Design a protein around this ligand. Structure first.
Ligand SMILES: Nc1nc2c(ncn2[C@@H]2O[C@H](COP(=O)(O)OP(=O)(O)O)[C@@H](O)[C@H]2O)c(=O)[nH]1
Ligand SMILES: Nc1nc2c(ncn2[C@@H]2O[C@H](COP(=O)(O)OP(=O)(O)O)[C@@H](O)[C@H]2O)c(=O)[nH]1
Ligand SMILES: Nc1nc2c(ncn2[C@@H]2O[C@H](COP(=O)(O)OP(=O)(O)O)[C@@H](O)[C@H]2O)c(=O)[nH]1
Ligand SMILES: CCCCCCCCCCCCCCCC(=O)O
Ligand SMILES: CCCCCCCCCCCCCCCC(=O)O
Ligand SMILES: CCCCCCCCCCCCCCCC(=O)O
Ligand SMILES: CCCCCCCCCCCCCCCC(=O)O
Ligand SMILES: CCCCCCCCCCCCCCCC(=O)O
Ligand SMILES: CCCCCCCCCCCCCCCC(=O)O
Ligand SMILES: CCCCCCCCCCCCCCCC(=O)O
Ligand SMILES: CCCCCCCCCCCCCCCC(=O)O
Ligand SMILES: CCCCCCCCCCCCCCCC(=O)O
Ligand SMILES: CCCCCCCCCCCCCCCC(=O)O
Ligand SMILES: CCCCCCCCCCCCCCCC(=O)O
Ligand SMILES: CCCCCCCCCCCCCCCC(=O)O
Ligand SMILES: CC(=O)N[C@@H]1[C@@H](O)[C@H](O)[C@@H](CO)O[C@H]1O
Ligand SMILES: CC(=O)N[C@@H]1[C@@H](O)[C@H](O)[C@@H](CO)O[C@H]1O
Ligand SMILES: CC(=O)N[C@@H]1[C@@H](O)[C@H](O)[C@@H](CO)O[C@H]1O
Ligand SMILES: CC(=O)N[C@@H]1[C@@H](O)[C@H](O)[C@@H](CO)O[C@H]1O
Ligand SMILES: CC(=O)N[C@@H]1[C@@H](O)[C@H](O)[C@@H](CO)O[C@H]1O
Ligand SMILES: [Zn+2]
Ligand SMILES: [Zn+2]
Ligand SMILES: [Zn+2]
Ligand SMILES: [Zn+2]
Ligand SMILES: [Zn+2]
Ligand SMILES: [Zn+2]
Lengths: 552, 552, 552
């Protein structure tokens, strides 16, 4: 319990002393570190970002003189609405109509709205274009043309084109002072666009005076290539963008506004979609006991102040999350070099690639790395068997069911014989499937008999048992007794169990000798000749030999 | 230095040829990859997202005719304020009061505000409800009821209920054209909701014409199940939501507005919390040398245009961060299969689980995988000792202090004897704690004597030294000499150092034979019988035997 | 193909039974888990956050009485603009000017704008400060001073200071009711700041009544330490911040507003930058056939309602991304303990650190862990050679080109001789560079001769070949024959190939004996004495000895 949680597991590793792999690893590590640092610093991913809340206060300055003969002056109480926040309006043109009473009168002829006769007109129809209700009559607007008769404020001048050139062109010489107060409430920071010690006699310039909050309207239009004289005729919408890219860290504090301009209304608006910008405003006051009204259609530019931006401040959680996101990228060197080792250890490299390209020859050392790095094993299953023929240099793995066919004729995968422990070695008639002649028929049941139908060689020749090594290793009683006493020093050498143990040790001795690996010697199957020679050397009394058994 | 940084470390691995584990690994890999790809594509986590900046320009079209007998017409200069941005107001009802002068007069009787007598009223009290100052008198408002006397604009009509049905119901037939210009300044993209080639004679429909920016107000109310006729009596607030879900990538560019509607005022507002929407506006003009005023309480619907949304564009840093965040999820297959291997290699599986369920039987192969994967080691500490009794099949680890008690009676953990290197083996009176009789008392100091008080067996019987293997392996002088000359071929076989080396080699020979692992043979303790037989075979001259020493 | 994808690779590990390392691992795991959980819960990183869309409806209540003698009352139609959204204005002071006609008249003397003579004035100059056009004359404004003569609305009172104390001070006793409707459209949630069952007779207090949406203006000023009486003289801008920190999860639902106040205009604005807040508004109506105008300069406080906040709701993708970002932090225990193992296994620890500090002594066990964890290997390259001198206890690695110099005099890195497999061992004239006398000159070509110019010892003495172990291991014909028949039991012992194999086995036998590791024995170079003794024991017929060959 306690000893199970008081454990630490660490990976077994191979440390390769390689110039190429070391330099590749360090180059990849430096590349990953450089990119991660660059992404962290350029994007400021260690910071929490917060949008601002903004308040705008505008002040327009400028007066204009207009003739018609009546000479008048327009000041901020004339061309400017009480709007002093995000939007302000400057009038650049106007149309006047005095003395309007709600009564029947002909509509203004605009865009060919002339009425030929009462048939061309329609009674009881609401007309938003003329802002009246047609009575179905056709009275002459003028001595030449006739228009529909509407009940509305009269006289009506709807559809009259705006004066050209614009009357209040001098509005391009007006200036606006903009005061912008911004706040980041999450970061608990506030600031404004006008600081103490700032020059007040300046006007904004994108290069000379980029922080002066006083803007000449004509300069605003000239900056983005717009014609104030042309826009003044019908009006439009212009946007003054204030951008706050604010760094709220003490060591890199920077919170200044950036001013830009952008036309917000479509220059190519369809004629039916009301191009430009205007509004009709009226003063109402009855006279002679009759409701009167004076109407002015004012054209001008609406200015929208768009204030946006974010403020960033160092946050530990953001940095931790970013570092955790980038941590897995430092396995790139491992992935790349392991891919190099695995790829160049394949046999297809030496067979096909190396003869073609001799530059790839010194990279055959990856087979050594692969065999010092990976240990291939197979699943121990009931059908797993290993055979080895003395007339062959390799070993066969049979990993399929035997459907009565003898194990001799069954084919399997070719696996190589592992190299032995040379450190220790440095010390001082016959059946149809039998190609050696010493094999004997199996005494196992029929359905299992094919398991024991194996020969020591695939081709006719001498038997493995004929060699002196078979007697020295497998059949030597003294060697087997010493091996058995190594494990159990005080073993009782009496009874029939000693012969059973001796048979087991002879089988193992043979499996170890022919199948070097203990993983393969466990599932190795002895040929009939060796098996029956062993059983003739150590016979059992009153029983039947069990044969190979599954070690799991 | 340079050779220390020019190294590469790679993990040692075991490659298991398993159908089950391979298919599980690939299924888990595919599941993780599928979910990661789905999360990346559906949420567009490879994109940087930016909120928009918006500009709105509205145009209301519609005229109404109202009787009272005076017949009048209302156009955009009557029912519409100069607001043409995010909000516009449409008047649906009104109350009129002409000829107001600042003087004493009775308050309007509303919600039972009748005054019984001067006691019920109060002098010198500001009354925001009646918008006046009470003088403490109680004059009759009418021939029947009496109300408090206030100094304010007179005549006063505060508290008068709005007309029902609403006078300007026809405002439901009005239309509004909305022009919306949006910008993503970080992505440097701009667009508008009206494009060239768009039909202008349409009206918005959620299915037939979902991109027409012309909205009929009654249709707006009908879309969300609101009654324009009922809302028109007292007014309200309606929101036109413009949503921009914009994809700014070239291969998947899509930036269109989506229009929705939502009532913004509470339908069930408390009567004291001013339900509906209205405002009082007045025209001031003196007459007869006295300040006069005409007041209109206008009820109507305020429309708030709410424009919101984000624009996304592909960003390499976002993709890198997301991929780094998802990289660690590809260790799921390793975690799961390692848990399977570790869990099924426990002995509790075979003892308890396998007899109950026979389907779990073929999964006993995880013990082989575990023993081919993990190598358990223990911390080398001064109290670490190993003992092995010839009458027992296992080994005992003593990992605690000996408080004078003999090592024979001290209990320890049962560890198994590791399998030997069978590849190499295939070649050609007595003390009270002594159960064999050949043990001798220790000559070490008392406080350390208990270290050497160990017997070869826990039960009475034959001694380990009696076996011939003890003479062949431990006591054979020729074997020890050959072993010593293996390490040092030109060793000088003279002096008393040769006997010391021979004793050391005999101890090691015995430890290796009984404790197969070199990790366990280092801390193994020889029993007294073997130790003293060795020391009688190779005695030392003029000294005391040091005994077991800590190899670290 | 199919058997290549049906594989699973698992890491080989060492399980250390250590109290220190286990407790360190679990402490680090718990620390990482605790911090990750705290960061997830405190920052709610499992949630998708969305900004709100807001609608504001304000209602101001309050009336004031002002003397001048004319006694008047101001209600919401007097001091309040039709603004009922994010901003509303309350008038706190005013200046009046009646009967204005567009004509020539002297400018008001403000800030020393007196005109000494016509020289001091200028003709044809637009003056935004006085809102007129100077005609270049100098007429007396009063009997004492003279000012410039401008064509504008007359009489002009520009530059007149605001009345002190403020006329509408009682506006501090006014109240505003704020209705705020907020929506999260991505989360499909909507709410408002007034809920059913909320008291209506309350007023806001930051502690007693923090959810009452009725605010007294004087209380707003007192909360942030502002003086309403002083601000009322010239006006200002105040911000009512509504903050919505809304949790939209069912188990932790919380969506309430938080109210704060902040002055939005600069208290220390420069006199030339228009401090305070005011606007000039005029009523136009002609009289006596002449255009007249009444102008009022109104000073007051503009209130900006700033509504901001985010709503968060549980999102599975956010949680998955956060967990993936934090997953790599659980390798901290592995990194730390591996660093501990690697650091304390260095030899500099025992040589320098341990003698100084005896507390670091029990931590010398990390050498055992390091050698059970890491296997150092080197790149097999053509210049890789190993030598071992019998008069030395170590082995020399030569990893550089031999430029004709004999291998005996070439220096290399000192590598230690690995420990043998003691489990198996427990069983039963001369050239100038020759220091033993049995070496012979090499028969290889000159450019390669230096490869074979190696001696068995660096100092004069006995030769390695003189030992009996050389005959038993290397020169024993029977041992070599048994070793050869171990690999090939049916080998044909005929021809000259048997002597070649015997020479190869003798070289290997010697390399294994002197260079224990097979990785080092492959590149080991035999000294001339041993090589020529072997070749005299097994000479070849009609050929030249090839010598050492690169095994790759
Ligand atoms: N690897 C392997 N083991 C074998 C083979 N034949 C028998 N054995 C082992 O020998 C034991 C059976 O011995 P057996 O001849 O039946 O003696 P018995 O049990 O006394 O009749 C089993 O435990 C098997 O593991 C073989 O061909 N290959
Ligand atoms: N593993 C193990 N080693 C032992 C034991 N007894 C002695 N040794 C080793 O034998 C050496 C001491 O030999 P010793 O009998 O004192 O000979 P002396 O030094 O000449 O007196 C030490 O280095 C020990 O490592 C034992 O019971 N177990
Ligand atoms: N490791 C090692 N191998 C050697 C050395 N000398 C010879 N060999 C091996 O012995 C083989 C050459 O044997 P050689 O004496 O030329 O016999 P020959 O080919 O019949 O002339 C090569 O495959 C070498 O690998 C040596 O000094 N060190
Ligand atoms: C995931 C990448 C796998 C690449 C394996 C390529 C083949 C390696 C063996 C040889 O050839
Ligand atoms: C990723 C490493 C790929 C190396 C190139 C592949 C060349 C194969 C060599 C053999 O075949
Ligand atoms: C990456 C390409 C590596 C070179 C291609 C194989 C040549 C060698 O091997
Ligand atoms: C990324 C670099 C890939 C280099 C592959 C070849 C380098 C190993 C040498 C062999 O060939
Ligand atoms: C973290 C998961 C650990 C699970 C271990 C369960 C027990 C495995 C050994 C047997 O039983
Ligand atoms: C995670 C794998 C859990 C496998 C089920 C546990 C069954 C235990 C078998 C034994 O005991
Ligand atoms: C997951 C459950 C696995 C099956 C439970 C144990 C049965 C076997 O072992
Ligand atoms: C997730 C799949 C878990 C499968 C556990 C059992 C599969 C291995 C075979 C045994 O039993
Ligand atoms: C990355 C950290 C590397 C630290 C290695 C310090 C030296 C270890 C060997 C000893 O000393
Ligand atoms: C990170 C572990 C550092 C341990 C302290 C270093 C002490 C060195 C010991 C030797 O030298
Ligand atoms: C961290 C400091 C560890 C102690 C410094 C070395 C002392 C021992 O070793
Ligand atoms: C972080 C803890 C570091 C501890 C280092 C020393 C602990 C191992 C024992 C030795 O010394
Ligand atoms: C449209 C307009 O009136 N623009 C005038 C320009 O004519 C004049 O030259 C300039 C200098 O004062 O001021 C501005
Ligand atoms: C640079 C440019 O084209 N400016 C034009 C100007 O030529 C034209 O007279 C005026 C009339 O609207 O509009 C502007
Ligand atoms: C409230 C109102 O006037 N609604 C009218 C409706 O009565 C009329 O049928 C329809 C057709 O023009 O136009 C709209
Ligand atoms: C569908 C529905 O209920 N419509 C009602 C209508 O019946 C009612 O006459 C009118 C008066 O406000 O209000 C609306
Ligand atoms: C606390 C405080 O200083 N209040 C001042 C008050 O003393 C002063 O009379 C008034 C005039 O503006 O302004 C405020
Ligand atoms: Zn046969
Ligand atoms: Zn045979
Ligand atoms: Zn005893
Ligand atoms: Zn004994
Ligand atoms: Zn020599
Ligand atoms: Zn020599």
């Amino acid at each position: 319990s306690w000893n199970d949680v008081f454990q630490y597991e660490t990976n077994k590793v191979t440390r390769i002393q390689s110039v190429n792999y070391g330099t590749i690893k360090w180059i990849l590590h430096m590349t990953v570190f450089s990119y991660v640092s660059f992404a962290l610093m350029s994007d400021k991913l260690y910071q929490r970002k917060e949008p601002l809340i903004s308040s705008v206060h505008t002040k327009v300055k400028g007066v204009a003189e207009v003739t018609e003969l009546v000479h008048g002056i327009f000041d901020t109480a004339d061309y400017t609405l009480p709007l002093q926040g995000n939007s302000f309006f400057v009038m650049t043109n106007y149309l006047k109509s005095e003395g309007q009473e709600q009564k029947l009168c002909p509509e203004y002829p605009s865009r060919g709205k002339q009425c030929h006769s009462d048939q061309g007109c329609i009674k009881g129809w609401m007309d938003p274009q003329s802002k009246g209700i047609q009575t179905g009559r056709c009275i002459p607007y003028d001595q030449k043309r006739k228009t529909c008769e509407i009940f509305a404020w009269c006289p009506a001048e709807e559809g009259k084109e705006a004066p050209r050139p614009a009357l209040l062109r001098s509005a391009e010489n007006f200036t606006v002072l903009i005061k912008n107060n911004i706040d980041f409430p999450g970061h608990n920071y506030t600031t404004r666009n006008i600081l103490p010690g700032m020059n007040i006699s300046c006007t904004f310039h994108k290069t000379w005076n980029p922080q002066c909050p006083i803007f000449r309207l004509g300069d605003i239009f000239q900056e983005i290539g717009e014609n104030f004289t042309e826009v003044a005729v019908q009006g439009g919408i212009m946007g003054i963008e204030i951008y706050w890219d604010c760094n709220l860290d003490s060591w890199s504090h920077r919170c200044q506004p950036k001013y830009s301009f952008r036309r917000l209304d479509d220059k190519y608006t369809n004629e039916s979609l009301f191009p430009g910008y205007n509004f009709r405003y009226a003063k109402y006051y009855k006279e002679n006991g009759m409701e009167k009204r004076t109407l002015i259609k004012a054209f001008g530019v609406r200015f929208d102040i768009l204030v946006f931006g974010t403020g960033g401040k160092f946050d530990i959680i953001q940095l931790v999350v970013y570092i955790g996101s980038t941590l897995s990228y430092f396995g790139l060197a491992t992935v790349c070099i392991d891919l190099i080792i695995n790829t160049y250890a394949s046999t297809c490299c030496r067979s096909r690639v190396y003869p073609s390209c001799k530059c790839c020859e010194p990279c055959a050392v990856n087979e050594y790395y692969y065999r010092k790095k990976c240990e291939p094993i197979v699943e121990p299953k009931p059908t797993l068997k290993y055979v080895s023929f003395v007339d062959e240099p390799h070993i066969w793995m049979v990993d399929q069911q035997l459907l009565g066919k003898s194990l001799q004729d069954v084919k399997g995968q070719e696996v190589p014989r592992p190299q032995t422990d040379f450190l220790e070695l440095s010390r001082l008639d016959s059946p149809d499937w039998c190609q050696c002649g010493n094999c004997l028929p199996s005494q196992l049941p029929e359905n299992r008999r094919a398991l024991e139908e194996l020969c020591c060689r695939r081709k006719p020749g001498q038997c493995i048992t004929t060699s002196e090594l078979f007697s020295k290793i497998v059949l030597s009683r003294e060697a087997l007794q010493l091996l058995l006493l190594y494990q159990e020093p005080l073993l009782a050498l009496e009874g029939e169990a000693i012969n059973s143990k001796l048979r087991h040790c002879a089988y193992r001795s043979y499996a170890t000798w022919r199948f070097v690996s203990q993983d393969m010697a466990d599932f190795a199957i002895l040929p009939s000749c060796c098996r029956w020679k062993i059983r003739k050397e150590f016979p059992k009394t009153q029983g039947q030999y069990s044969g190979f058994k599954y070690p799991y």
